């Protein structure tokens, strides 16, 4: 087309994006590569720095030995955007910067040395919201420490303002990174990276959004997940869906500097179901999930499983599977079992998540699509063809909207549907 989306000034949430034309569910609205991105702390040396895909053997950069790649192609193609950070990562070994500092280093090299980035077509890094006039004194102290970390990390390549863009202010730049960073998940919906996508950063938040984002490696696809009218604002949910209105309030304040008065937040929509079961038990499970989630972020599946089994099959009191902390534990146990080849056990945990996921991911949401695909795949390979086909079709109905033909995972699902339908054809 011309574009289906445009920048505008909203009445009370800054700049946003609105529909130029009526939009239908599954319609591709925009796509972008990042201005800058990096692998997250826990996936470092587990996934390729460039394509964010995993592999038993990664090859490191010989100069810094921090960057690791899946292939010669990826190591070579990454070199231009790695060249300057390489000198810094080496210089500062064995100190590894926070992900926000590595990210901002890549922003500064891209803006100093690169051609104008296609990622900034609708909105640039310069234009991003910083919320500087709402930052608490505590936040400002933490930004000051990031600035001093960046100055330390980058000293080999950046000694003064001459090597930053004109009137670039590192404090403001970090403030922009906090409230504009995208979390990059792999095809299995595991966090692997963080990136800046300035055009896409126009999207304001809704706890019941009309669009979704998905990632195919570092590439971001924005799709409609509802009917949208001409002039209607486009929204995504910035947060994990498995959060109460109080948890959403805390993160939207702390990270985004705004108060949400949507219907869901006004009515604590779903919070009572999410916290069913005995509070003493779900409080302990919430506490244990800090460690389980840290182990998962480091791809430590045997330790994830052990901790999850101690909860799911506890000798002591148990939670209903609609309890969000129980549900996260089931999720982590399912993924651990898939990665360990414990496929009967995986399917047990995955099937228990299906009804909670139907409730907590209403309409078309990519996380529920992928979860249903995983369960259907487990059923297909265990010879449960009618159960598998039902789940793979449901996954397709969701993923055709959330992922679309432009996402390679849809090709993988199409192959599973074909295999399943050959089996029912022969039956
Ligand atoms: C839906 C899925 C889509 C993905 O791949 N990434 C993802 C990104 C965000 C996000 O970036 N929110 C902030 C937007 C910025 C201010 C514009 C939020 C959620 C994300 N997803 C996700 O399920 N999460 C993120 C992480 C694994 C946990 C849960
Ligand atoms: C990723 S940016 C979105 C674009 C931003 N409004 C701009 O002007 O650049 C995130 C910031 O937008 C604002 N924002 C996003 N969703 C909002 C909402 N539902 N209500 C109020 N402000 C919101 C907050 O300032 C938040 O930190
Ligand atoms: Zn690669
Ligand atoms: Zn290097
Ligand atoms: Zn809300």
UniProtKB/Swiss-Prot annotation:
Q: Which residue numbers delimit the MYND-type Zn fingers?
A: 48-86
**Pfam families in the cross-refs:** SET, zf-MYND
Q: In which tissues is it expressed?
A: Expressed in skeletal muscles and testis. Overexpressed in a majority of colorectal and hepatocellular carcinomas.
Localization per Swiss-Prot or TrEMBL: Cytoplasm; Nucleus
Please state which protein family the record places this protein in.
Belongs to the class V-like SAM-binding methyltransferase superfamily. Histone-lysine methyltransferase family.
Top-rank lineage group of the source organism: Eukaryota
Q: Where Zn(2+) 2 is bound, by residue?
A: 61, 64, 82, 86
Q: What is its main location?
A: cytoplasm
Origin species: Homo sapiens
Spell out the activity regulation.
Histone methyltransferase activity strongly stimulated by HSPCA.
Where are the stretches annotated C-terminal domain?
271-427
UniProt keyword annotation of Magnesium present: no
Classification via Gene3D superfamilies:
1.10.220.160, 1.25.40.970, 6.10.140.2220, SET domain (2.170.270.10), Tetratricopeptide repeat domain (1.25.40.10)
Q: Report the gene name.
A: SMYD3
The EC category is transferase
Q: What is this protein called?
A: Histone-lysine N-methyltransferase SMYD3
Q: Which residues carry this modification: Phosphothreonine?
A: 21
